[PDB]
């Protein structure tokens, strides 16, 4: 039993760029960057071009 070897296929392993693989700090930082940019668009800030819609 123990002597028997097991080969894990690469399919089960999560993708390198997946949010699960990425640490939570990076995801939170990107979300907060998006929120700050949204706030800057909502309230007219200097150097902010309104290139979006809605």
């Amino acid at each position: 039993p123990a002597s028997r070897n097991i080969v894990v296929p690469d399919a089960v392993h999560a993708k390198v760029g997946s949010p699960d693989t990425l640490p939570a700090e990076i995801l939170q930082k990107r979300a907060q960057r998006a929120l700050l940019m949204q706030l800057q668009q909502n309230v007219i800030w200097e150097g902010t071009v309104i290139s979006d819609e809605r």
């Binding site: 949010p19 640490p23 939570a24 700090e25 995801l27 939170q28 990107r30 979300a31 907060q32 998006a34 929120l35 700050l36 706030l39 800057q40 909502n42 309230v43 007219i44 800030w45 200097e46 150097g47």
Partner: protein
């Protein structure tokens, strides 16, 4: 400016005596009885009385009575006949290592335009205001000082927005993290800022509270947390080593935590009363000392601050969850008509309000631990 080294008292005295950039005003018959402050005001119109008092009281300006020693005088002391008054010069302040008082220098900077929408946002943000201080509800995502990216919004940038009927804009007395919301204090005047700066240094009596929603429940309801931080520079970020025992280069971080109400071993509502100021003391103490990370803290409780327990309320996969930490009930020295000190509170942010409502706990409640 640069080229100013830290000087001991003996070093400062030695530099002052060695420097040749001194002006000696003789006290003649006409200026015999005139007071020191009036004499300096008449002889230095460009300087301000603040600079005059700072120099006189810190010893940069003195008088020589032919006595073989330099007398250090008060602003209210009268002059004498045939005595010199020694005052430094721009050369004395610039071309040597002795730094000047932070007023006499003529440094200046440009301004920056603000939009009407930004001004209205600032006005709505303001919570409390008097002739001396303002307390504003700094939001969650907004930063305090300029970020590593120059093109970003900041409380420092918006400061001119709440320059109500004053020539000079207020000055932030203390700073908050980019993820934490709640009360932040601005001094209207420079004297008010100097007087109020003594509040935010390390203290033994708490004067403000932090309401936090922490994943998990600490083993004890109320207690004290003490951790020594050894913040050091790293590749891009900064490393924060926390230890229980002191160290030569370490700085202490002390808080009093009270578990106001804990749902179960899964989540808890805590109030932190800090006795010291450090980079991320509340978050670090909640994550490590209490082993209960804040519900939105991914910098320390990564993948643990976002629990599957509250999947019904918050999506565990939404890493953008705002930090469930909120500065509240800042106590100010100024009193009110009733004789009690002013405790400015800030309404809970949207996420914390939602969590409290879903758990059934009330949101608007007075914290008696901060009178």
């Amino acid at each position: 400016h640069a080229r100013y080294r830290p000087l001991s008292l003996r070093a400062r005295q030695t530099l002052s005596e060695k420097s040749d950039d001194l002006q000696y005003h003789v006290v003649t018959q006409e200026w015999f009885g005139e007071r020191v402050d009036s004499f300096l005001t008449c002889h230095y119109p460009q300087w301000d009385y603040e600079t005059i008092k700072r120099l006189v009281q810190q010893g940069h300006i003195y008088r020589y009575r032919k006595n073989g020693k330099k007398k250090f005088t008060r602003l209210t002391d009268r002059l004498e006949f045939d005595e010199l008054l020694v005052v430094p010069t721009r050369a004395f302040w610039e071309k040597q290592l002795a730094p000047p008082s932070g007023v006499l220098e003529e440094t200046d900077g440009p301004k920056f335009k603000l939009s009407a929408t930004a001004r209205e946002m600032a006005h709505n943000m303001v919570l409390f205001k008097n002739e001396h201080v303002i307390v504003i509800n700094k939001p969650h995502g907004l930063p305090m000082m300029p970020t590593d990216d120059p093109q970003e919004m900041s409380i420092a940038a918006m400061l001119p927005a709440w320059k109500f009927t004053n020539v000079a804009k207020p000055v932030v007395c203390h700073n908050l993290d980019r993820e934490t919301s709640g009360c932040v204090v601005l001094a209207r005047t420079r004297n008010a800022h100097r007087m109020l700066g003594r509040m935010f240094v390390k203290r033994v009596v708490p004067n403000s509270v932090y309401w936090s929603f922490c994943v998990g429940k600490p083993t004890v309801n109320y207690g004290r947390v003490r951790m020594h931080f050894d913040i050091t520079r790293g590749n891009k970020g900064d490393i924060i080593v926390a230890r229980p025992s002191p160290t030569k280069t370490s700085k202490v971080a002390i808080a009093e935590f009270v578990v106001n109400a804990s749902a179960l071993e899964f989540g808890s509502f805590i109030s932190f009363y800090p006795l010291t100021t450090r980079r991320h003391q509340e978050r670090i103490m909640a994550a490590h000392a209490l082993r209960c990370p804040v519900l939105g803290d991914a910098k320390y409780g990564g993948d643990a601050a976002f629990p599957s327990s509250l999947s019904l309320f918050w999506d565990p996969e939404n890493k953008g969850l705002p930090l469930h930490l909120h500065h509240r009930k800042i106590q100010l020295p100024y009193k009110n008509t009733a004789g009690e000190f002013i405790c400015v509170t800030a309404p809970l942010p949207t996420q914390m309000e939602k969590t409290f409502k879903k758990l059934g706990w009330p949101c608007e409640v007075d914290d008696p631990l901060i009178p």
